[PDB]
Design a protein around this motif. Structure first.
Motif, short mmCIF file in Angstrom:
data_model
loop_
_atom_site.label_atom_id
_atom_site.label_comp_id
_atom_site.label_asym_id
_atom_site.label_seq_id
_atom_site.Cartn_x
_atom_site.Cartn_y
_atom_site.Cartn_z
N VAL A 88 54.98 44.95 36.15
CA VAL A 88 55.57 44.52 37.41
C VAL A 88 54.64 43.56 38.14
O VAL A 88 53.44 43.49 37.85
N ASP A 89 55.22 42.84 39.09
CA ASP A 89 54.52 41.81 39.84
C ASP A 89 53.26 42.36 40.50
O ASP A 89 53.31 43.35 41.23
N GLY A 90 52.14 41.72 40.21
CA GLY A 90 50.89 42.02 40.90
C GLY A 90 50.12 43.23 40.41
O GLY A 90 48.99 43.45 40.84
N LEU A 91 50.73 44.02 39.52
CA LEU A 91 50.10 45.25 39.03
C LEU A 91 49.32 44.93 37.76
O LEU A 91 49.83 44.25 36.87
N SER A 92 48.08 45.40 37.70
CA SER A 92 47.28 45.19 36.50
C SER A 92 46.49 46.45 36.18
O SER A 92 46.20 47.27 37.05
N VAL A 93 46.19 46.61 34.89
CA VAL A 93 45.41 47.74 34.41
C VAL A 93 44.25 47.21 33.58
O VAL A 93 44.45 46.52 32.57
N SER A 94 43.05 47.55 34.02
CA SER A 94 41.81 47.22 33.32
C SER A 94 41.12 48.52 32.94
O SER A 94 41.59 49.59 33.30
N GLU A 95 39.99 48.43 32.25
CA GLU A 95 39.35 49.61 31.64
C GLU A 95 39.31 50.86 32.54
O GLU A 95 39.74 51.96 32.14
N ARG A 96 38.84 50.68 33.77
CA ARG A 96 38.66 51.77 34.73
C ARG A 96 39.39 51.47 36.04
O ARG A 96 38.99 51.95 37.10
N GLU A 97 40.46 50.69 35.97
CA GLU A 97 41.12 50.22 37.18
C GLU A 97 42.63 50.03 37.03
O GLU A 97 43.09 49.42 36.07
N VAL A 98 43.37 50.55 38.00
CA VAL A 98 44.77 50.16 38.22
C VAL A 98 44.78 49.42 39.54
O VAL A 98 44.47 50.01 40.58
N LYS A 99 45.13 48.14 39.50
CA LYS A 99 45.06 47.29 40.68
C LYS A 99 46.45 46.92 41.14
O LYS A 99 47.25 46.39 40.37
N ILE A 100 46.71 47.19 42.42
CA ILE A 100 47.99 46.91 43.06
C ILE A 100 47.83 45.78 44.07
O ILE A 100 46.96 45.86 44.93
N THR A 101 48.64 44.72 43.95
CA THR A 101 48.53 43.58 44.87
C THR A 101 49.86 43.19 45.53
O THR A 101 49.89 42.26 46.33
N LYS A 102 50.94 43.88 45.19
CA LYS A 102 52.22 43.64 45.84
C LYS A 102 52.73 44.92 46.50
O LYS A 102 52.42 46.02 46.05
N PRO A 103 53.51 44.77 47.59
CA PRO A 103 54.04 45.96 48.26
C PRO A 103 55.04 46.71 47.39
O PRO A 103 55.67 46.12 46.51
N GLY A 104 55.19 48.01 47.65
CA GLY A 104 56.19 48.81 46.99
C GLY A 104 55.71 50.23 46.74
O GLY A 104 54.74 50.69 47.36
N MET A 105 56.39 50.90 45.82
CA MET A 105 56.11 52.29 45.50
C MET A 105 55.54 52.39 44.10
O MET A 105 56.05 51.76 43.16
N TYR A 106 54.47 53.17 43.98
CA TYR A 106 53.74 53.34 42.73
C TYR A 106 53.55 54.84 42.50
O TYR A 106 52.91 55.52 43.31
N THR A 107 54.12 55.33 41.41
CA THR A 107 54.13 56.76 41.12
C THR A 107 53.21 57.07 39.95
O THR A 107 53.39 56.54 38.85
N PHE A 108 52.24 57.94 40.22
CA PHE A 108 51.18 58.27 39.26
C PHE A 108 51.29 59.70 38.77
O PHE A 108 51.57 60.62 39.55
N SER A 109 51.05 59.89 37.47
CA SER A 109 50.98 61.22 36.88
C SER A 109 50.00 61.23 35.71
O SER A 109 49.74 60.20 35.09
N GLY A 110 49.48 62.41 35.41
CA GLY A 110 48.61 62.59 34.26
C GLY A 110 47.15 62.59 34.63
O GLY A 110 46.77 62.31 35.77
N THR A 111 46.33 62.89 33.63
CA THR A 111 44.89 62.95 33.79
C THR A 111 44.24 61.64 33.36
O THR A 111 44.50 61.13 32.27
N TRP A 112 43.39 61.11 34.24
CA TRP A 112 42.61 59.91 33.94
C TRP A 112 41.13 60.28 33.98
O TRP A 112 40.63 60.76 35.00
N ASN A 113 40.43 60.07 32.87
CA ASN A 113 39.03 60.50 32.77
C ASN A 113 38.08 59.73 33.67
O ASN A 113 37.06 60.27 34.11
N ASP A 114 38.39 58.47 33.95
CA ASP A 114 37.46 57.61 34.68
C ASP A 114 38.16 56.37 35.19
O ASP A 114 38.41 55.43 34.44
N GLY A 115 38.51 56.38 36.47
CA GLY A 115 39.16 55.21 37.02
C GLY A 115 39.34 55.21 38.51
O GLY A 115 39.07 56.20 39.20
N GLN A 116 39.82 54.07 38.99
CA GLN A 116 40.08 53.83 40.40
C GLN A 116 41.46 53.19 40.57
O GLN A 116 41.79 52.25 39.86
#
Ligand SMILES: [Ca+2]
Ligand SMILES: [Ca+2]
Ligand SMILES: [Ca+2]
Length: 250
Positions: A18-46
């Motif tokens: 989706v627009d503006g959303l990116s995933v890097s090694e230890r990062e989920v980066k949000i840059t556009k408005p809206g709703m973001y739903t997260f689930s599950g275990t992440w060992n190391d991230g922001q």
């Protein structure tokens, strides 16, 4: 507006494109408005939110366990407001590092397990545990509002830190703090510098003050029980505390 789903699987991330959303090694980066739903275990991230001061986002925590070995699990660099929704019946856990690493060592933010440079509202009837090993539990330089949730905070320094204000209108909140349970600092902006508790069940164990506020503390229609080394309420300004609300934690 975006409506995206992000699923953690320890060292894998499955995310909507989706627009503006990116995933890097230890990062989920949000840059556009809206709703973001997260689930599950992440060992190391922001989860990093940087959408601009005129835009809003909702982070739905739908049963997530995020650890960050270097920094804060949630860091909001910019937003008009971010709402963190605690999904009903789900268990959410956020765990930060004992010592934060700052990629630019001249930075000293983020400095809370959930940290925002802008307004943050926590809502919903779900569960949240904030393990804050570095400094503050939930921190913002502006206004913190909690309207619901079974929220447990364990913080090395201050439990809830809202430089502008802290408002609690609902929820079952349990704070353990090495400094103040709830702390507010702002001296200048009109009608800031306050702690306003208008609902909820709150338990505070603090080595210093349960509530440390500069201009105002108001408590009504709530059950606040504290055990502290300093004062139950420290405030240089006014106190408006309804009888039968503030008592001792047994
Ligand atoms: Ca701001
Ligand atoms: Ca504000
Ligand atoms: Ca204090």
């Amino acid at each position: 507006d975006v409506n995206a789903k992000i699923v953690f699987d320890n060292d894998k991330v499955n995310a909507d494109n989706v627009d503006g959303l990116s995933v890097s090694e230890r990062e989920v980066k949000i840059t556009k408005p809206g709703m973001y739903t997260f689930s599950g275990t992440w060992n190391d991230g922001q989860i990093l939110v940087d959408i601009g001061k005129e835009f809003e986002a909702v982070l739905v925590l739908d049963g997530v366990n995020i650890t960050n070995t270097k920094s804060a699990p949630i860091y909001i660099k910019s937003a008009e407001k971010v709402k963190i929704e605690l999904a009903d019946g789900k268990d959410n856990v956020l765990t930060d590092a004992e010592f934060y690493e700052f990629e630019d060592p001249q930075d000293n933010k983020p400095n809370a397990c959930i940290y925002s440079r802008d307004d943050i509202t926590i809502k919903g009837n779900g569960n949240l545990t904030v393990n804050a090993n570095f400094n503050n539990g939930i921190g913002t330089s502006n206004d913190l509002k909690i309207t619901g949730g079974n929220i447990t905070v364990k913080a090395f320094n201050n439990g809830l830190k809202g430089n502008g204000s802290v408002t609690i209108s609902g929820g079952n909140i349990d704070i353990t703090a090495g400094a103040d349970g709830i702390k507010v600092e702002n001296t200048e902006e009109p009608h800031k510098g306050y702690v306003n508790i208008t609902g909820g069940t709150i338990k505070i164990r603090a080595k210093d003050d349960a509530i440390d506020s500069v201009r105002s503390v108001s408590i009504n229609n709530a059950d606040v029980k504290v055990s502290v080394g300093g004062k139950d309420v420290k405030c240089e300004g006014v106190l408006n505390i309804a009888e039968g609300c503030l008592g001792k934690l047994e």
